[PDB]
């Protein structure tokens, strides 16, 4: 079992190299240039940030409440890496009995990471500011549950392997046309900075950037796929990396282009604007496999 170690270390490198792409794409979106002084094209900075932030940079304790502050990174980094396990990359690491149920649960358990960090500081201004950020993460997981339950209702069971077979010639973007717009906004939930923004600082957002790639690959299975081809696993993986990274650029696009929504009006986007639309689609997606025969 070397595969688990082949889904942690190169995965953490993808999180490390994200900081460059976030600085370079947003850079070219702002007419400035990316990192260049560091390496050949600034490629030696993700390792340079790792030596800077971890080794010599210390932590001045605000209070250090015994069990917490050291427990919150375990709920952050640990739960972000467990999400990679059931992903249907050609043949997944120990394929689950139900795929998306494990996907939705560990993402909803990732809410504690920002909750325990709110308890980590003694100051009241920190926790009230923390609960406001929890309120954003807590609300958009209702829509995350609804859109998933309407996409699967079209085709496939909870297994992630069956979501590849349904997209043999046609993507799920076209039958779920309003849901494709809806799921893209609802993915901006785990402090994505594009809708609204609130141990050490370093490893805390290493889990937050990992969740961005996680949702980028999750969009690339639920809505993309093109084919499978069991004969050659290479042809799928090359095609998947292009599809996943094109959605990764779009998260660096919304963050670059659009300002903060005002927290109240972001909560007015849900319940008043999003939830009447998604439930009407949820009603519509119940009737579709009954109107025309298609219940796999």
């Amino acid at each position: 079992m070397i595969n688990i170690l082949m889904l942690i270390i190169p995965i953490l490198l993808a999180v490390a190299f994200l900081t460059l792409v976030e600085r370079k794409v947003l850079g070219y979106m702002q007419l400035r240039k990316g990192p260049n002084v560091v390496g050949p094209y600034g490629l030696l900075q993700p390792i340079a940030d790792a030596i800077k932030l971890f080794i010599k940079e210390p932590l001045r304790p605000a209070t250090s409440s015994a069990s917490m502050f050291i427990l919150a990174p375990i709920m952050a980094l640990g739960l972000a890496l467990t999400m990679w396990i059931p992903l249907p990359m050609p043949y997944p690491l120990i394929n689950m009995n139900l795929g998306v149920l494990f996907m939705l649960a560990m993402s909803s358990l990732a809410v504690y990471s920002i909750l325990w960090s709110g308890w980590a500081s003694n100051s009241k201004y920190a926790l009230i500011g923390a609960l406001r950020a929890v309120a954003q993460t807590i609300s958009y997981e209702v829509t995350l549950a609804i859109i998933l339950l309407s996409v699967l209702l079209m085709s496939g069971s909870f297994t992630l392997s069956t979501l590849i077979t349904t997209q043999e010639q046609m993507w799920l973007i076209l039958p779920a046309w309003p849901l494709a717009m809806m799921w893209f906004i609802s993915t901006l939930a785990e402090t994505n900075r594009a809708p609204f923004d609130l141990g050490p600082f370093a490893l805390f957002f290493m889990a937050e950037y990992a969740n961005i790639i996680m949702m980028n690959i999750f969009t690339a299975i639920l809505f993309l796929g093109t084919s499978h081809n069991p004969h050659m696993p290479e042809l799928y993986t090359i095609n998947f990396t292009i599809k996943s990274l094109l959605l990764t650029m779009s998260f660096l696009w919304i963050r670059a282009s659009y300002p903060r929504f005002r927290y109240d009006q972001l909560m007015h986007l849900l319940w008043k604007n999003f939830l009447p639309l998604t439930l009407a689609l949820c009603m519509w997606h119940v009737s579709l496999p009954i109107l025309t025969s298609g219940i796999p």
Binding site: R260, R262, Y263, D264
Partner: protein
């Protein structure tokens, strides 16, 4: 400018828009959120250098 026969102006005052716009914030903020206050300062353009006199 208040001036004498000498070359030195004894007290001059420039009442910059800072004192005018910051006086309005007692009325501008009534029945508005925390994030609304951020929008008020920018659109009025309360440059903090204005508050000198």
């Amino acid at each position: 400018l208040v001036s004498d026969g000498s070359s030195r102006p004894y007290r001059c005052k420039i009442k910059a828009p800072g004192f005018a716009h910051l006086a309005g914030l007692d009325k501008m903020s009534k029945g508005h959120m925390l994030a609304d206050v951020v929008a008020i300062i920018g659109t009025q353009d309360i440059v903090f250098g204005e508050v000198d006199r």
